[model samples]
Target: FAPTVKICENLSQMSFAAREVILAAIDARVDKSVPVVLALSGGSTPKRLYEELHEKDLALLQQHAVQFILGDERLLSEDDEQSNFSMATKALLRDVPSSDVISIDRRAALATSKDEKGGLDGAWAVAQDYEVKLLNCLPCKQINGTAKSVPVVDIVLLGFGSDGHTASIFPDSVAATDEEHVVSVSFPSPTMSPKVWRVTLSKTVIQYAKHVVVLAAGKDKNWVVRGVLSESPTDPLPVSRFLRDCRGSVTLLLDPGAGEGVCA
Candidate 1:
């Protein structure tokens, strides 16, 4: 099915729409007494959404029993500025119960030598731990004629980079193969830009998620948004691949500037 695209007049409207979705989801889950599992992406676009969630009715936020997990994370300590957990902690998680948030153990996920070659071991360990925890929390779904076990997060919030990367999955990266649920990624020196090692949920995880909301703002992202909706095989944009595989509904939330060129 085609993604449901909502273009807002401004960032404020976009954020409010996102907030409403979360609140509605919470209400729906609470009525059924089911726990809400949210997989949050780390990026600039989500910062405002976090703020909106934080400012909502505190009792409602707490009583809904939402479990927060990261879709991807940098291999940095939780206190580091570049850490995704740090951003969420400072902006919203401080008010959330520690037990409700499933953050990567920085010491365990970052135990690497100075050369960074061994970092994948630690990342693997962290990912495995989260995978086990998620399986125990939610039911595994059957995919491709088999019972493929992966974290089935109820809701996933994502953002796209201008270069078409999503959740640290760059264009033509190994993460796009729809293989394992979680894997470590790194860009080497010969690459266009060297990025720090990261642990990200694979396309398999995102594909099976119950819901996905992608936010893009600013005119700078217009071209990328167009490419994602176009689904050009030659482009191989990760967001396009993700949208194509979604089992549940996908929503593309955009401000006017970002939606200028994107179609319905």
Candidate 2:
């Protein structure tokens, strides 16, 4: 549950390190040939990382068993400019055609008519549908011997906002303890253009994942990074809360601008 922080020279450097992290996870799971489930993040920082992940040699390693899942998605069609799935597809999936992926069924949901099970009442129906797909695809990890279950994902890629928000989870938002596999949210804190419904994997899924990889770049994130990385904040923000609560491995890849002199 300790975080291994690596401060890099820049975005390119951080991206390279993330590639190594994903490769190592695949190598570790190759023996049993267990599927390497990766819950991916969105945003410019993560988008660049996805481009880095779209490598021929890297995808060649147990390519068939790599399952890429979206950590959060804007309630829009896969082809929309604001869609995380669209960004990820253009950046990585399109290049790595042989790789397997599970995405939010936005295209179909957008087309569905009210009672036809084809149209979305709002984001609620789509959110519930996605959770069902998640339950079936992910492997269950129990709390006790044959106890209550939770899905276990191998790796989760994440990025933080300057406000310490991660995966559409705003500061002190109700999403922190909703106790669900997935939930739909509205950006109460205000977000970038095309603000709309967001279907995201709840904190439960993220915290229980086997590994969490966070990438931070740009000077804008310096303060939030410092707050999250130093003095072991008892009252952490959304980002720090995830780092503090996660049970699996955590790695923070920060560029010099973002990391600054935070780690003393």
Candidate 3:
């Protein structure tokens, strides 16, 4: 399906638009006795949206049926500024039931790493453990005539890097085609900080989601934003690839800086 692109006047308006979509998802399922799952994004762009979620929906936010899941996470401590989970927790997620937030077990992963295999080798156990949590929350279903069962989420929030990476799946990374629903991935650090490993939802699972929203802002994203919509890209950009394969409704929320030339 073609994407629904909204060129908002500013970030606050963009956040409100995002909130509407998320609230709509939650509202639709409230009477049906189902979970309203939100697979969240982390980056320079999404923290404001998280704040909006808290400021506007703190009551519903605390409700049991509304659940939050980190789309991807660094192997860093939960308190690190660069950590996605840390940014999300500070923005919102303050003292909710532990079960309401489906996050990476970073402490367990680190301790496991320290005990046996050092470095990222222990990420395998973490990925396996996280799969069980995801399965329990979002049961898997076999679809598209394949025996492989796909875990599903109600909605996903995403941000693409200048390099066109999404959810820690960098351009040309092998995590793009992994068989597991989630996998361990590593990429060049965007912040000139030290390098690190990450765990992310696989592309196949992302494509399987019920709906996906991608957020972009600023002129720094201009070239890539215009690049993806204007014409077929020269390289296999991950954002472009994501747009191509996504199975459900796609919504792109952009500020004029990112939507400038393309809207015309």
Candidate 4:
């Protein structure tokens, strides 16, 4: 398959690219009528993209059986400003049906406080719940009451951090090598606190998807994009690991400022 790595110049162009993606999925749904599973990333940038999608005509938005899964979520209430799902829902999901959205349960007791317990535990519990949700949508392939199957995702979207992290998988974190359906991660202080822990699908889970698209915008990410795409294989990038030997392929969607300095 051909790899599509394109750069849009600004938010307007970025929104256009997002529309193209959702429209394509709608078309695919017309033919398949199967649930179009997608992984949503958190951050201010993706919020604009969600707005464009939400504002589209309702018929177009409802054309598909859509479900959203979080690529990663912080240990905070869905109502928290830092919450990815909250932003996306407020920006776009309000107009959609509850059945169409699936998220990692980020609302729970914090591990402790700012120095809380691992964030992963709460996320893992929710992840298992999502696994059950997926099972209900598809056939039962259970292992210890949990679905043991390759859930085909229509699109797995993610945001690229300035430091090249995606879905909470920091540059050198243990979560980078997570092998289970979900795993906890710990990062150094200043960058992370409770100092660690999150529940994102393992790289294995993401790699199984039928399609994967990564979104990054603005100039600050240009250097990280270069490092992620052009770096040597032995020295792995978080995205590189997810893309490695992927049955499908990784799609990098960027605004011109984000891709400007990255190599072609």
Candidate 5:
């Protein structure tokens, strides 16, 4: 099914609505004892939601088990200003148990030794280790023909870049073709500034999620929002492809500025 588009009056409304969806999802869980797994994207909208979450009625979330995973992580150190984990840690996870948060260890991944090395080797190993941790924590089943496996995250929060990328999956990038749950990616020069490498969940994993929320706001996002709202599955844009292929429901949370062309 096509995604449901929600137009909010502003960022505040968007954040509140996002939190309500999260709260409802948590409340609807059949088994409160099982962990409510979530894949979180890094962005201002998400930050706002985290803050609201901290202030809102978190009794349900606080009572039930929860596990947070990154939809993507930058190649930089955890302390770097651009680190998504750092932002989320301060914004939301500080009050939550440390064990519930799974972050990409850039330092461990970059260590120079027999077991680890820098560059792609280090990145791949980190991705592999994360997969191991995920496998140990979550229950997953194997595919029939291929060795590939995809875990079902309870909910995935994603953001659309004005350039049409989502969750660090860029146009014409290797992430587009990745079949595994997670892979290391390097955005080539000119496609993105600073040309940093990243680790992101594959589209397959995103598609397998039980629910997905695509949060976009501001006039700056109008172009991509229109593209994702109007484009066909064959458009070749990462967000479009993700919206098209997702097995579960997707909701688009937008403010007036971002929803301009979309609403019309």
Candidate 6:
């Protein structure tokens, strides 16, 4: 089934959406003691959401079996200032119970050859290994033991670029069309300065998720935000594809900026 799509007027509304998202996950946790898996995206509002959720004093965040995974990772040593994984971990993960968190082993990623051709190749390899581990939880019927694609995330949080790309799936990029692998390596447009390699889940992998959320804020997001929530007449942006193919639900939580141009 296609994912359900919901949009709100602003960050405050989006905050409510985040709260509901977490509560719904807790509902599932009520049934299964095992921690629910949440795949997070890196974005402006998401950073604030983490801080706000932290302030909410939800002890369950520390007590419940909560596992955090990244939908993508910037290609850099963990110490790099730009690593989203590091940023999120410092912002939220470190404050929570260790048992409640599980981050991809960035250090374990491997290069195709010992020569370590591209740093991102190692990150991609590590991403693949994580997928293999997740496949262990799927019903045998679902994977059929062929782990080309594995859907381990129960809820995936997203943030869209003005260009309409989510995660590292940039517009018209090769990774955008990739489907067979759960995670792959990525690099920004050569024209984009300070380009860096990244490890990102394939659009196909996210399509298999049970829930998806897009958290956007500010007026800067107006143009693409408007297109992402509805049918696209010109080009189908990634968020459009996300809404079209998601197996369960998609929620677009917007801030005032996005509200200006979107249904929210």
Q: Report lDDT per candidate.
A: 0.71, 0.71, 0.73, 0.64, 0.72, 0.65
Model 2 lDDT vs. the true structure?
A: 0.71
lDDT of 4 at 207: 68
Candidate 1 per-residue lDDT over residues 152-202, each given as its tens digit? 778888887766667867665545554756444532222323255666777
- Alpha-carbon runs more than 4 Å astray in model 3: 108-119, 189-194, 230-240
For all predictions, the C-alpha RMSD in Å is: 2.9, 4.1, 3.2, 3.8, 3.5, 4.0
Query: Which candidate order results from sorting by lDDT in descending order?
Result: 3, 5, 2, 1, 6, 4
Per-residue lDDT over 1-264 for candidate 3, one digit per residue giving the tens place of the 0 to 100 score: 478889999998889898899988988884645678788898668899888777878877666667788887767788888888888888888855677888787765665433322545556566667777887777577767666566787898987676666787765444655655555454433542235566778887788888999898877766666666644554434444556668878888999987887764
Candidate 4 residue pairs in clash (backbone atoms < 3 Å): 8-256, 111-117
Query: Model 6, 141-190: lDDT tens per residue?
Result: 25445645466577888887766667877665556776667776566543
- TM-score, candidate 4, is 0.81
lDDT of 2 by residue, 112-170 (tens): 32222322355567677777787777787665554456668889898888777777666
Q: Quote each prediction's TM-score.
A: 0.86, 0.85, 0.87, 0.81, 0.87, 0.80
Model 5 over residues 1-264: C-alpha lDDT tens digits? 688899999888888877877777878879877777888888566998887776775554566466888888776677766778878877777777767777666664445312212355666666777777776766565655888667778888988776677887777666756765544454532445435566678787777788899888878777777666665543433344556678888999998887886664
Superposed model 6: Cα runs more than 4 Å off: 1-10, 28-30, 107-120, 136-149, 190-194, 236-240
- Among these predictions, the greatest lDDT belongs to 3
lDDT: worst 10-residue window of model 6: 108-117
Per-residue lDDT for 253 in model 4?
A: 86
Better of 1 and 4 by lDDT: 1
